[PDB]
Ligand binder design. Sequence first.
Ligand SMILES: CC(C)CSCCC(=O)Nc1cccnc1
Lengths: 300, 237
Amino acid sequence: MNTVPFTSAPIEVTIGIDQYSFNVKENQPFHGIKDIPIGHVHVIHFQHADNSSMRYGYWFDCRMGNFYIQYDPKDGLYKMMEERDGAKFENIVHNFKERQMMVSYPKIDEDDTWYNLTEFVQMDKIRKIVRKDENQFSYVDSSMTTVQENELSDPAHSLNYTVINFKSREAIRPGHEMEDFLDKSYYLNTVMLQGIFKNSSNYFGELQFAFLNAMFFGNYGSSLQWHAMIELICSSATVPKHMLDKLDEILYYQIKTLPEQYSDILLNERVWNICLYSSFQKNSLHNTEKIMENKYPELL
Amino acid sequence: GAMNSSNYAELFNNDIKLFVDDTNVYRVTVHKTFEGNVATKAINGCIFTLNPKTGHLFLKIIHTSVWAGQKRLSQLAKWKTAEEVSALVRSLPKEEQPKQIIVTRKAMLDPLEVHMLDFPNIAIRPTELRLPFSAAMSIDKLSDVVMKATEPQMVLFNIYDDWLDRISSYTAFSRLTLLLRALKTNEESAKMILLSDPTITIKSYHLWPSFTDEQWITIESQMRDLILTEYGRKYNV
Ligand SMILES: CC(C)CSCCC(=O)Nc1cccnc1
């Protein structure tokens, strides 16, 4: 179990850690988050009390270094930093734990939610979507645009998700126009899985990362990416059976975790109705169809 | 975006454009089977691809053999249309290729866009105009070449005959759309109007009769009357 200490909390802020959130008052003696499960990526995120504009946060993996948070009064945000002096860091954490000034990652033993949402998400792949090679952790916020959004403007601050475009030469083989547009299996299996992602685990990792950025930061381009990666699978007649079964589990846990009151903005009616009721895979997502019908029957 | 009454003069500017109408591509007769079920029999069809500025019509005849052994023919017909329009564009010299292609039915947008990916600078546009190009098969010479075809064939016509020697392309298109709207609303009456008088003939190299300017005014008035007539007979007004 690892710890992310905070130097202090000088401004009032709602802090998230994965699917959990707590309120810290301005200058309230707060010294970080302990008991963070090892073995998963994590995200620590922020919304200031005085400007709910800009949710922002950091993806990290405690196995890759000792990380802490420190507020910067010039740039006006809580920043993640790495401490290279391991003995300094352990000494800092032990003192903060002795004074009991940290919140405990509040995981229920029965509960696999976070594993289920991050099963295929790897830090190394996050760092290729979010390019800032001098840091071991990755910053994301509400406003960052994707490479594909930038084609339709600062490249260093972009989300480099894999571009998916159903009316593109990459997606459509010359001479197979109708076939490839109506059945996207060659684009899914040959172009994307064999060619770009290499395997379905990397595809699911990017899909899951896109969903989490949409949910935690309201990042619109991430929501677009999540839906495009669902639609590409659902619109393929030929999908390995293990991928369909895994997709059903992935989406089930995403829909289960989504705040009921954000469904209007985070769920695309057209994609979901097409995927569950019209697509080739309309009968392959039983768990997802059941939770959607019981939790969001309005959208459908 | 979409072509409508507001941007109507754009049709007659000097940017090459084509209308594509697919309503006569897949044509069937519905009939009873010996067991009392219903079946369809396809008949030859055509793509109607028209330059509204010059009157040049590229009539691609769709022979019934293209449907043999195929499923979902109404969907296939849109893709076959888009395949043939793309092939036509590729066949034309670069300086003759269109800048825009306007489809008369919105269901042609995605098929045509996908077939024209190699031409990113050709705009594929819908229209809000309800153009009467389905009535092309009421022009006797067009219907004749389609029905007689024994294989796929492209035939080139000028749908304006020689009108552009005397009138502008705006006026020629307005005459064409009026004639076609009339043929669509009451084919029998429209054709009676066009041929009632035996002394006005259709030249061998023309589609419509050789009316003088004054006779075209009478004709056009008779077509408007017919369209209004039928509009009453219909709605009881
Ligand atoms: C009384 C003194 C010995 C500190 S004990 C309070 C532990 C704590 O810091 N909880 C907390 C909860 C939410 C946000 N920030 C902090």
